[PDB]
Amino acid sequence: HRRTYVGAMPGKIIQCLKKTKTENPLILIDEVDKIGRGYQGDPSSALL
Amino acid sequence: DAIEEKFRERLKELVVPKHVMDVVDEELSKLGLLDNHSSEFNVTRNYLD
């Protein structure tokens, strides 16, 4: 989130980068096929 | 206003339309009044950014 919203925390990716502590881990997106394409903001655009 | 300087100084060269210039003027007037910790202040700060 923007960090001006109440309760904002960084996106999932930053947590994985924080966790693996290397710049080049092996991210594994799982189960891409059934991603939720709704009116509330389609993540599938975000993946591009 | 120091933080907005990075905007103002640019504005000296790339002309500010009189509409846009007045709008940033009243926002510049409001911005100093606002409390440092209101979530509305961070929101209007990001908006003005």
From Swiss-Prot, chain A:
Duodenum, heart, lung and liver, but not thymus. It is found in: Mitochondrion matrix. The Lon N-terminal domains are crucial for the overall structure of the protein, maintaining it in a conformation allowing its proper functioning. Belongs to the peptidase S16 family. It is linked to CODAS syndrome: A rare syndrome characterized by the combination of cerebral, ocular, dental, auricular, and skeletal features. These include developmental delay, craniofacial anomalies, cataracts, ptosis, median nasal groove, delayed tooth eruption, hearing loss, short stature, delayed epiphyseal ossification, metaphyseal hip dysplasia, and vertebral coronal clefts. Homohexamer. Organized in a ring with a central cavity. The ATP-binding and proteolytic domains (AP-domain) form a hexameric chamber, while the N-terminal domain is arranged as a trimer of dimers. DNA and RNA binding is stimulated by substrate and inhibited by ATP binding. Interacts with TWNK and mitochondrial DNA polymerase subunit POLG. ATP-dependent serine protease that mediates the selective degradation of misfolded, unassembled or oxidatively damaged polypeptides as well as certain short-lived regulatory proteins in the mitochondrial matrix. Endogenous substrates include mitochondrial steroidogenic acute regulatory (StAR) protein, DELE1, helicase Twinkle (TWNK) and the large ribosomal subunit protein MRPL32/bL32m. MRPL32/bL32m is protected from degradation by LONP1 when it is bound to a nucleic acid (RNA), but TWNK is not. May also have a chaperone function in the assembly of inner membrane protein complexes. This is Lon protease homolog, mitochondrial. It comes from Homo sapiens (Human). The chain holds residues 561 to 608 of 959 of the full protein.
